[PDB]
Amino acid sequence: SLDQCIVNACKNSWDKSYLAGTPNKDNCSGFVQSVAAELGVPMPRGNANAMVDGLEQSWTKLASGAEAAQKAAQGFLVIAGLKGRTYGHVAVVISGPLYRQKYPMCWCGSIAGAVGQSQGLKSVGQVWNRTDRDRLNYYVYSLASCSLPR
Ligand SMILES: [Cl-]
Ligand SMILES: [Cl-]
């Protein structure tokens, strides 16, 4: 799989604070911003809800979590997102076998603490609850790859 630069960016972004005084581990949107910044990928800005709005507008929408995992394996930046009535959530999809043959692996920060956080060993199906899991949107930046040629 070709996601090593993405994973590296996730690892680096974990300890950064995109927003003053707010660790990215505790801020899903700031985490994703820092990942994109390291990768040089234009990323819609703002809170999780504003990010999903932006991604809907300007990124390529994928059909499934299966496809999300495939695109991440090809070295493309893939964001999983779902708007909330109050606050949304966003995560970076990484390569790896699908959880329950449906849900791709991810990294994400969360204000919720450990229950909403992933350092790559949780799938989106173990961060979002049983109902939200099957309603997630997956967006890919199809314009340029986030991998260096083999
Ligand atoms: Cl938010
Ligand atoms: Cl693509």
Residue numbers in the entry: 3 to 152
Recite the paper's sentences.
Most importantly, the T6SS from the Gram-negative, pathogenic bacterium Pseudomonas aeruginosa was shown to inject at least three different effector molecules (named Tse1, Tse2, and Tse3; Type-6-Secretion-Exported) into the periplasmic space of competing cells. Tse1 was shown to be an amidase that cleaves the γ-D-glutamyl-l-meso-diaminopimelic acid amide bond of crosslinked PG, and Tse3 is a muramidase that cleaves the PG-backbone between the N-acetylmuramic acid and the N-acetylglucosamine moieties. As injection of effector proteins by the T6SS would also cause cell death of siblings, P. aeruginosa co-synthesizes the cognate immunity proteins Tsi1 and Tsi3 (Type-6-Secretion-Immunity) and shuttles them into their periplasmic space to confer resistance. Tse1 adopts the fold of N1pC/P60 papain-like cysteine peptidases, which are widespread among bacteria and of which homologues were identified in eukaryotes, phages, viruses, and archaea.
Interestingly, native Tse1 crystallized under similar conditions but with a different morphology and with a different crystal packing. Thus, phases for the native crystal form were obtained by molecular replacement using the refined model from the selenomethionine-substituted protein structure and refined to 1.7 Å resolution. In both structures, four molecules per asymmetric unit were found which were virtually identical to each other. The core of the protein is formed by a twisted, five-stranded antiparallel β-sheet in a half-barrel configuration. This half-barrel is shielded by surrounding α-helices. Cys30 is found to be in close proximity to a histidine residue (His91), which is the second highly conserved residue within the N1pC/P60 family. Together, Cys30 and His91 form the catalytic diad commonly found in cysteine proteases. Most likely, the deprotonation of the cysteine residue is performed via a water molecule (W1) which is bound between Cys30 and His91 rather than by the histidine residue directly. In our crystal structure of Tse1, a water molecule (W2) was found at this position. However, in Tse1 we observed a cysteine residue at this position, which cannot maintain the correct tautomeric form of His91 with a hydrogen bond, demonstrating that the minimal requirement for N1pC/P60 hydrolases is a Cys-His catalytic diad. However, in the native protein DSB2 was absent.
